[PDB]
Amino acid sequence: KPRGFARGLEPERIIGATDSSGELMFLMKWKNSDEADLVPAKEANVKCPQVVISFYEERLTWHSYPS
C-alpha cells in the first residue's frame, strides 16, 4: 500500500514531528482521511510549504538561547 504523498491525497495539517529516525519527519493528516502517516520534512517543505509553515508558526514560544 502506498504511503505518505504516494497516496495521492492533499495535505491538511501536520500533527507532529520527530527526528528519531535520523531525519526530520512529519506526521501528516491528509484531507478526507483520518489515517495519518509519516512524510520526510524535506519532501513536505517542497510540496506543501504553507502547511509546514503553519505547523511551526503556531508552536512558537520564547526560549533562552543555550550556551
Partner: protein, 118 residues
C-alpha cells in the same frame, strides 16, 4: 579620491560603524563574564545612541554566547556561570514541541456543518 563619498555612501558606512561598534562592546562584555544589570543598562543606552534594534541586539548576544573563544575567556576571567543571564538576554522565538510519539499524536477532529441559520 578616498574622501569623495556620496551622502548615501556615508550613511552606509555610518550604519556599518554603528553595528561594528555595538558588536565589539557585546564581545568585550561577554568575555568579562555573565551579563549584569549595570552592563544591561549600558547596552540599552548604547543601542539607543547607535540605533541598534532590540532584535539585532538579541542576535548579537547570541553570536557572542555561541563564541567558544569568548566563552573560554569568560571562564578564565570570572569562572563558570558566565552565560546564564546572557542566555536569557538573547532569548528567541522557537518552535517548541515534544517529539512525536503515539501517546502524544494529538488533534481535534470534527464533522463540518452547513451554513447561515439552521
Amino acid at each position: 579620491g578616498p574622501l569623495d563619498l556620496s551622502r548615501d555612501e556615508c550613511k552606509r558606512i555610518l550604519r556599518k560603524l554603528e553595528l561594528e561598534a555595538y558588536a565589539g562592546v557585546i564581545s568585550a562584555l561577554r568575555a568579562q563574564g555573565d551579563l549584569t544589570k549595570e552592563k544591561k543598562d549600558l547596552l540599552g543606552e548604547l543601542s539607543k545612541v547607535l540605533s541598534i534594534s532590540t532584535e539585532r541586539h538579541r542576535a548579537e548576544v547570541r553570536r557572542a554566547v555561541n563564541d567558544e573563544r569568548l566563552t573560554t575567556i569568560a571562564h578564565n576571567m570570572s569562572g563558570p556561570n558566565s552565560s546564564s543571564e546572557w542566555s536569557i538576554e538573547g532569548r528567541r522565538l522557537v518552535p517548541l514541541m515534544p517529539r512525536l510519539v503515539p501517546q502524544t499524536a494529538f488533534t481535534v477532529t470534527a464533522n463540518a456543518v452547513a451554513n447561515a441559520a439552521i
